[model samples]
Target: MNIFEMLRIDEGLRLKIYKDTEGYYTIGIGHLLTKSPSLNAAKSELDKAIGRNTNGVITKDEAEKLFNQDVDAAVRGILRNAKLKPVYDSLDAVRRAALINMVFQMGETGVAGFTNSLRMLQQKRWDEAAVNLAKSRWYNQTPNRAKRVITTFRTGTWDAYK
Candidate 1:
């Protein structure tokens, strides 16, 4: 399945299947129980949320561009934070994309907060990283979700359902 499909667009979430100038699709949270645009102008608002270059107003095209770039930047940031340069430098395209996606969803700085965890990962300490991953605020905030992603990273398997 594609990344958008994995994110699960529904009544409560907005999805942009098309890519923008920067090659990213913007996703936004809609009303809690309905598909109504919670913000007066949702695309522009979401652009702001993702740190758009524009001042305020953003067109659909602009939104797409910003979203794509934001996701890419977020992913890159995460990889850099994890110090996965050697592994990433050697990974296949697909594996690299999956890793980026996971990191984008989880902020890079937040992921990097695990000092010992990163050290372990640098040493190819899978079990140690797993243990440190569990001790993080990311794990505490969303244990199930964090566990699912951590499992994928540890096992080198991507299960979209998780």
Candidate 2:
């Protein structure tokens, strides 16, 4: 299945748009409306596709398109950070994906707060970076997730869960 299909299955389809738990004007399969004027065009496009009433139902294809745009922007934002560029560039594909996923969950700035971790990654100290990653509240909350990602950082491979 495509990402849209997976997300639609995971998030569940809601023909009628509604606000997310965080109160964002979310609709379809978890498309969050943005306040950025830069995105106004996109929102307008959505509104045109749906309507200004916000009652229009969204489809899997629509949600997936929006998701793709959002994911792309997030990755671009994360990759373009000067502070993280060196660190991000030094990582292997799996580790790079790990960092992108981390940033997507906890914004680039939030991940930047891991100064020691970023330093280690920037310096090409994989094991040290993994250790630094483990020493975080995020790890405490989701040890399994952190463990795999940390393992990726440590081994620079995708099969870190092993």
Candidate 3:
């Protein structure tokens, strides 16, 4: 599979930190080390980073840090997405941020299905991309968020929907 495919598969698999089929605790895009000591050390580091015990519960601050790390890794995989990379690189911060969220939520493979939207982006057709994005299944699943995302996509303004 392509690197982007691997990214999505990893994303799907590592969607959250939990025990895998083999029952060993894992986190961070299927980070599976056969040794318990290694896994325990990694868990301890994560706990210290979060400043709490996740077993009982985790702080939102901790959750946020974990999410940031995971998304950062996911976003870096965009380097392998040749088709979307140019437009992504050319976008303003608002659209770039939105694209990263899009990729994280739907996976690069999922967003690649937005052929017309990608085409529009490549051609610098902001309005077309906005319209197409609004009509997507992702949009259908979350209309309000879609409105916000498409607004940013079209105008690069956080309050565009307002």
Candidate 4:
């Protein structure tokens, strides 16, 4: 399965504005409005993607488009990190998707904080990597999602795909 399919299941879709677990204004497929360069810029991008004024609402297709864009940024951000590049290159597609999913939710910096976990992943120590993930604040904040990602890491499978 592709990353989009897994992410659609993990992030969920919302046509209207909603507060994320962190209480930030978000829309579409986990698109954090506050994290955008600017609210207006984001809205404009949404309008362009949907080909209409969003007015704080979005279609499934629009959501998918935005999600794809976010994934591109997340992928780029992950690869841009010097230390992560080789580790990312060493991973299989499924494991790469797992890493991308983490970056998508937490940004590159957040994922970069998992030093031991990334090291374990690079060494193909799946169990230790998963253990590292389980011990994280990310795990505590989003147990279900983290569990799926951790399982993907442990098994090198797309278990998170629906």
Best by TM-score: 4
Model-by-model lDDT, in order?
A: 0.50, 0.64, 0.62, 0.85
In model 3, the Cα lDDT at residue 137 comes to: 75
Q: Give each model's clash number.
A: 1, 0, 0, 0
Model 3 misplaced stretches (Cα beyond 4 Å): 1-53, 160-162
Give each model a TM-score. 0.54, 0.64, 0.63, 0.88
Better of 1 and 3 by lDDT: 3
- Per-residue lDDT of model 2, residues 78-124, tens digit only: 77888777777776676776776566545678887888898988788
Better of 3 and 4 by lDDT: 4
Choose 2 or 3, whichever is better by TM-score.
Answer: 2
Ranked candidates, highest TM-score first:
4, 2, 3, 1
Query: Once superposed on the true structure, which residue ranges of model 2 sit more than 4 Å away at CA?
Result: 1-57, 160-162
Over the stretch 1-162, how does candidate 4's per-residue lDDT look in tens digits?
A: 888888888888998866677777678898877755455766765576667888778877777788889999999998899867777999999999999999999999988888889999999999989998899889999999999999999998886665
Candidate with the greatest lDDT versus the true structure: 4
Per-residue lDDT of candidate 1, residues 45-92 (tens digit): 555565654433445554455456656676567556536455455554
The reply for model 4, stretches above 4 Å from the true place, is 35-52
Residue 71 local lDDT, model 4: 97
Score candidate 1 by lDDT: 0.50
